[PDB]
Amino acid sequence: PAPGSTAPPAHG
């Protein structure tokens, strides 16, 4: 089952 995207964090 494809994960899909997530919301980008403030820190990388």
Epitope: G4, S5, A7, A10
Partner: antibody, heavy 116, light 109 residues
């Protein structure tokens, strides 16, 4: 549209414990990093911590990792902040926040007063 | 460890104002992922910038992020009276953010 509803604001005595909740709706909670901060008069804004969607990374500011614990339940769209052994200087308005590039979404705040 | 900002700045509507953000450990670099958060009355917090340059969706274009010398910076072009507020900076140190003391920005009303 997006609501971060916080719950559990009140009075606790020095050395007590307390758990705050923040229920998220309007976004896919399971896909957002979440964070806890606090605001007190004269103490500005202080970053407590953050937690990834899968909870496998829980980052804390070293000064507060000892007696603060961040958790989440994705099935119930809920973020939790637990505090132990609290002291007078822990009095503050605590805020849950959701990351999207920056501190994108914010809760309404939860007042915690530590007084004997 | 400690993040320092100007305590207060005053500008006029339509003018340009730049707030800075210093790290006590060294020069502020992209890996500090400077964040900028705005506090308006009634503890209304609005995320402005993340990772130095990226605007939070919905933030107007007049809020810009950059690095100036050894510091991070937020620039408001054509400041509006509604921008009168406190501006907190946050720098990332490997595994935790540290907020600065905040800058009270006055946009003369």
């Amino acid at each position: 549209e997006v609501k971060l509803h916080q719950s559990g604001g009140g009075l606790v005595q020095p050395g007590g414990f307390l758990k705050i909740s923040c229920v998220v709706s309007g976004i896919d909670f399971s896909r957002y990093w979440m964070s806890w901060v606090r605001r007190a008069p004269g103490k500005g804004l202080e970053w407590i911590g953050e937690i990834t969607p899968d909870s496998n990374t829980i980052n804390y500011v070293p000064s507060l990792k000892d007696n603060f614990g961040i958790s989440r339940d994705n099935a119930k769209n809920t973020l939790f902040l637990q505090m132990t052994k609290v002291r007078s200087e822990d009095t503050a308005l605590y805020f849950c926040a959701s990351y999207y590039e920056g501190f994108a979404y914010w809760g309404q705040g939860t007042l915690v007063t530590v007084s004997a | 460890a400690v993040v320092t900002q100007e305590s207060a700045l005053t500008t006029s509507p339509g003018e340009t104002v730049t707030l800075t953000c210093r790290s006590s450990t060294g020069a502020v670099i992209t890996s500090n992922y400077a964040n900028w958060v705005q506090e308006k009355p009634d503890h209304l917090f609005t995320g402005l910038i993340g990772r130095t340059y990226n605007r939070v969706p919905g933030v107007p274009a007049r809020f810009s992020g950059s690095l100036i010398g050894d510091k991070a910076a937020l620039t408001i072009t054509g400041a509006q009276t509604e921008d009168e507020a406190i501006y907190f900076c946050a720098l990332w140190y490997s595994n935790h953010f540290v907020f600065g003391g905040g800058t009270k920005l006055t946009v003369l009303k």
